[PDB]
Design a protein around this nucleic acid. Structure first.
Lengths: 302, 305, 333, 333
DNA sequence: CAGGTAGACGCGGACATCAAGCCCGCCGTGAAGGTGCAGCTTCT
DNA sequence: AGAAGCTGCACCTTCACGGC
């Protein structure tokens, strides 16, 4: 209402053992004579003027700046659906979980961790809150409960991520393969420079595989039996286990020699099925040649 | 019965001053009610001329940049406002706080009607895009792709237009175009599940959703409890304060031919998945649910799990 | 009879945020590889140069305060030392459907308003209004502080038809002044294009890019962000600039107010200059609000004298009324 | 007629962040591709030079005075060992239209202030002010500590018209003193050009270069950054020199302070020299604030006597008031 | 107008220690409020 | 000499501290 009448609400919220039977003072008999101990006319009139003007409405309206939004009915038609601001006080639950005993739980969390036994109550943090204040300097013009909090609607965030989260979230090799296929598609006199460019392209492909093995050495030392082991037993150990998570030689096939010939074989099978031009079949001796090429460059590590 | 036969993909739209205020309890990304109202306005302006219905819409949000600032000393953030002109006599007017944010979101929406057999292949999508370029999305003007190094086209994929291997191939080539984004999903079964695991001889008022929004770093014999995905609070519709009134009853309405009602916001839980774990892209679409003589003017993503 | 109780009008002539790049003059041809100017935070040391309040104080602490320094931390945007040209670029959508109210209660008021704007566009279409908008795009008025020290400024405007350019304009923004509205050929062509985009026919997308010769290493001004400074140390920094995609830019409303300032018809010495088109026409610079409703020249009284009491205003004031209709707003009783 | 509650004045005489390069003397003419001075972060071993506190006054922990090398981490900027000349380069716009505020509330106060500034500039133009500005540009006062031990300092001022010079001045900066404003023909020409830029009668952007013979491989002093972070140690540098793109530089507000020292009128002992122009005219390094409000010679009382009560001060105080208006800032109730 | 096939590239062992990390001063302000009534003013 | 609308003025009214 008008802020100048807010004084009367400060008269009506006087908790003299009960302010609910004082604002809408209906269940009182002594308070009517206590409001004016002279007669019963002005006492009853003031009592009904106090219980009446706090349960009264007027007329339904929405003065040209309140929001009101069409909602599509299922068959056809609409409703106008004017939203009104609620007085749900999560602000009390926000303030009491950020100042009252957030301090005690936070000090138990922040000086008792060597002590494993801390205090048996937790706390939250509520990050990325947003302050919204309705009345600018004088918030009394809005309402009464907009003066207890000094504005400060305290909005919780939504904020869609950007491919990183703590809760949960989620091509030059193709250029080399394409130019290798387009190179062995056509032939110009079939001389030394063709085999030089073929060795050049397969050299770039296998050092790209070496760079892929090196740049995936930056993930973690210890993997596990994470699923998808249909292609992941020979190339399981080509991506090295960093020799630091082992620490007691828990793996016996790390140096048996099982990995390099099989990794070269399956790499050359991948390059067989990937590079197959109008000269359709590529074949097994070329597979053995590229297999032993990558196998020499993988046993060169030790 | 609201099942699409196509999925018009509108590409990565950029939105310059959205409504970063979403609800009286939540800020950040705009309401999904804005996206359902945008698609219903598109069906009002385009879809009746093609005899097609436009129901359901996705959200990816390729990037988000709110216009906020941190008060230098506090743990919260305040909104960068705008400046309104003087009132009548020369005096700085009372400021209302409007939250504005720059969005970049692509959206796929479910075409439904009989206005496509094989004739409008990619002119129906061109018509919808070139008409939606002159429109706003949440209070934000959709910047319609100025002269740059590349264009960004639209797409129209049919579910019956292709066999099973082509169905999954077209789903894969559709989800490659919106893979850096994050799909927004209504999660109400998860909210009721977390409520009824929370409700062990103790009641609730609204803490079932506030407890999933926060970051509790509590101790159990410090530890920190984890949540699956970004479980955010979202405004999921409205609820009835008032019995609905006749058109010639409420003073100062938007028009005097529609019934008006006084409503409150409703609050639910949403998730920002990545769109490569959706398992059916015929899901992930936001539909209305009136039940209008009860209230409950809800919007959701049904048929999900 | 009675006016509409809810009367809304959407913003036609909607611009976008005006990103700022930096580069050398005469390299305006290859002005797409140009890097943007990034806002920096710098801490400054100054004095207590504000005037003091000698109420419930003592003289010793105040003159000891004005003897002592004053440490602040502001935001600043500079050109590099290898770039004497600022490149301010934005897009502009001319929507269409000018006089249509986006919300109106009374059907009779809606019909009379549509008939009024229909008779206006029939007898005098969007010629003068679009000519003034094309002037305020042609002179670089959207450079607010970036125009006062420029040696030469040039505005390049390109109409994007389908996905590519259809028409190119190149204007010298200093020959076209900020206070006069002349008549040329290319300006009339741009005004006819703006009128065609404003007559409901099309929704014209233009790009505007303005080159400004400021100087090597000089300081440019992106639009300052409004933080109300009522709380715990949220005003210690005193200057925050607007940044979108790691680049300094001007707000949308500032560019709109800059191409909107076309009104040279107010009852207080109209030879001063064009002011922004507002109801109760206000300038925040002079701190005055021209066209007060004590005189009969505000937007509200001219509106419900035009469409309600059937008396048309003067030929210059109905231009201002339709300029508020394009400007958009929330009115009604 | 009273003072407006918001009064903002925009910076005239806008400098840039002055960059520093190093080379050899007598190669001053081809000093375009000179290599820039970089900031080197070094770690020094020292002693305890500060006076002891009451906690370190214990007989056991006066060992910090005895054995503590004090292990600090500072920045430094040195010339190359075969380069004995520091070159400092910046640009300076002077805009004009000094008395017009960019923000006001009372339009009557705005008109009265414009009337007082107008009767000033048609009474006495910007002659003494631009003369003192050109004198502070003449002697390299912007070389702050780079001037106190230099053997010969020479400045070159180029009036950049479009992309080339239009008139070049070349001053021996040591012959022109730092305490008295003498007369010279080239100085009067530069003062007349700065006055023509200060009256809005032209666009004036100058390029100022200054060479100083510090010494072969000596230490030059750029601006030190202010770091607004309070109490912490063992990891704090406490000396961070300012640099743009790995080139040591002087702050723009430092140059703006240095070419503003034109105030030889203050009621204290003026036999020392010119100080900068601030309201309540302060030198916070010297710890004393001249023009205290206990005297009637600060900026605010002289301004509100000149504008409100129509009490015109002396001509020197008029120069001080207009110099504060050229400086800019926030004035008002 | 052409320019190679084959095969393999070592082990061991170790990688410093001492002592300290400054003091002073200060941190802009102006503007961002609604409702209700008393009286004045203008017009009839 | 009585009715409508505008303006001027009064009336209401201050916090708890350290990044999944």
């Amino acid at each position: 209402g008008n802020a100048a009448a807010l004084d009367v609400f400060k008269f009506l919220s006087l908790q003299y053992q009960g302010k609910n039977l004082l604002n809408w003072l209906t269940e009182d008999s002594a308070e009517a004579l206590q409001a004016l101990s002279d007669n019963a006319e002005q006492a009853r009139e003031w009592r009904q003027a106090f219980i009446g003007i706090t349960t009264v409405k007027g007329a339904p309206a929405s003065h040209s700046l309140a929001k009101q939004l069409y909602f599509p009915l299922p068959g056809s038609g609409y409703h106008l659906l004017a939203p009104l601001f609620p007085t749900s006080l999560v602000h009390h639950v926000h303030a009491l979980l950020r100042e009252a005993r957030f301090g005690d739980a936070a000090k138990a969390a922040r000086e008792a961790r060597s002590r494993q036994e801390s205090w048996p109550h937790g706390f939250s943090e509520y990050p990325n809150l947003a302050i919204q204040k309705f009345g600018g300097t004088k918030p009394q013009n809005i309402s009464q409960l907009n003066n207890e909090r000094r504005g400060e609607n305290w909005l919780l965030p939504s904020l869609p991520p950007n491919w990183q989260r703590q809760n949960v979230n989620a091509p030059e090799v193709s250029r080399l393969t394409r130019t290798l296929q387009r190179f062995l598609a056509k032939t110009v006199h079939n001389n030394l420079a063709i085999r030089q460019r073929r060795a050049q392209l397969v050299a770039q492909i296998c050092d790209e595989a070496l760079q892929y093995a090196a740049r995936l050495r930056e993930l973690e030392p210890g993997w596990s039996a994470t699923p998808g082991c249909q292609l992941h037993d020979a190339e399981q150990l080509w991506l090295d286990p960093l020799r630091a998570q082992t620490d007691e030689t828990f793996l016996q096939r790390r140096l048996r020699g099982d990995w390099p010939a099989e990794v070269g074989n399956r790499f050359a099978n991948w390059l067989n099925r990937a590079v197959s031009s109008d000269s359709q079949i590529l074949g097994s001796p070329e597979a053995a040649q590229w297999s032993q090429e990558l196998s020499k460059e993988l046993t060169m590590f030790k | 019965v609201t099942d699409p036969e196509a999925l018009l993909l509108l590409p990565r739209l950029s939105i310059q001053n959205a409504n970063a205020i979403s609800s009286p309890l939540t800020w950040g990304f705009p309401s999904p009610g804005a996206f359902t109202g945008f698609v219903h306005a598109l069906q009002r302006r385009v879809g009746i001329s093609l005899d097609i219905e436009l129901d359901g819409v996705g959200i990816v949000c390729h990037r988000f940049e709110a216009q906020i600032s941190q008060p230098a000393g506090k743990r919260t953030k305040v909104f960068n406002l705008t400046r309104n002109p003087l009132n009548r006599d020369g005096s700085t007017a009372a400021i209302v706080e409007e939250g504005r944010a720059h969005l970049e979101v692509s959206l796929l929406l479910g075409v439904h009607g009989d206005g496509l057999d094989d004739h409008p292949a990619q002119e129906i999508a061109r018509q919808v895009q070139e008409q939606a370029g002159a429109m706003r999305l949440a209070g934000g003007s959709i910047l319609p792709w100025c002269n740059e190094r590349f264009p960004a086209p639209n797409a129209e994929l049919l579910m019956l237009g292709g066999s099973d291997e082509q169905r999954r191939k077209n789903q894969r080539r559709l989800t490659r175009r919106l893979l850096p984004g994050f799909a927004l999903v209504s999660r109400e079964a998860l909210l009721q599940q977390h409520l009824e695991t929370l409700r062990t001889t103790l009641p609730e008022a609204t803490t079932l959703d506030a407890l999933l929004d926060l970051c509790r770093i509590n101790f159990e014999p410090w530890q920190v409890r984890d949540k699956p995905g970004w479980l955010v609070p979202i405004p999921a519709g409205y609820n009835a304060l008032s019995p609905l009134y006749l058109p010639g009853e409420v003073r100062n309405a938007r028009d005097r031919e529609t019934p008006l009602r006084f409503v409150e916001n409703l609050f639910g839980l949403g998730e920002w998945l990545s769109p490569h774990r959706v398992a059916a892209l015929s899901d992930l679409l936001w539909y209305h649910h009136a039940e209008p003589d009860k209230g409950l003017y809800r919007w959701s993503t049904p048929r999900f799990v | 009879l009675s006016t509409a109780s809810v009367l809304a009008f959407e913003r036609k002539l909607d611009p976008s945020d005006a990103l700022m790049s930096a580069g050398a003059w005469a390299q305006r041809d290859a002005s797409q590889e140009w890097p943007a100017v990034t806002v920096r935070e710098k801490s400054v040391r100054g004095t207590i140069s504000n005037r003091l309040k000698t109420k419930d104080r003592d003289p010793a602490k105040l003159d000891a305060s004005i003897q002592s320094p004053n440490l602040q931390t502001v935001d600043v945007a500079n050109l590099p030392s290898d770039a004497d040209t600022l490149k301010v670029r934005f897009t502009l959508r001319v929507l269409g459907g000018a006089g249509t109210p986006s919300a109106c209660n009374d059907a009779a008021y809606r019909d009379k308003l549509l008939q009024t704007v229909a008779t206006y566009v029939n007898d005098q279409g969007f010629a003068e209004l679009a000519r003034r908008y094309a002037h305020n795009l042609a002179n670089a008025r959207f450079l607010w502080r970036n125009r006062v020290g420029a040696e030469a400024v040039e505005v390049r405007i390109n109409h994007i038809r389908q996905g590519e350019v259809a028409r190119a304009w190149r204007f010298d923004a200093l020959a076209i002044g900020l206070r006069d509205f002349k008549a040329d050929a290319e300006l009339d062509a741009l005004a006819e294009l703006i009128a065609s985009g404003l007559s409901g026919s099309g929704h014209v997308l233009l790009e505007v890019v303005a080159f400004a010769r400021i100087g090597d290493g000089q300081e440019v001004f992106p639009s300052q962000e409004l933080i109300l400074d009522k709380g715990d140390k949220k005003g210690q920094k005193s200057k925050t600039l607007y940044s979108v995609r790691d680049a300094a830019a001007i707000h949308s409303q500032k560019i709109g107010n800059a191409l909107r300032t076309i009104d040279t018809w107010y009852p207080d010495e109209d030879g001063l200059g064009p002011i922004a088109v507002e109801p109760y026409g206000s300038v925040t610079s002079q701190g005055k609000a021209y066209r007060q409703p004590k005189q009969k020249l505000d937007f509200y009284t001219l509106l419900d004298n035009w469409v309600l009491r059937d008396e048309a205003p003067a030929v210059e004031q109905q231009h201002y009324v339709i300029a508020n209709l394009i400007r958009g707003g929330v009115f009604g009783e």
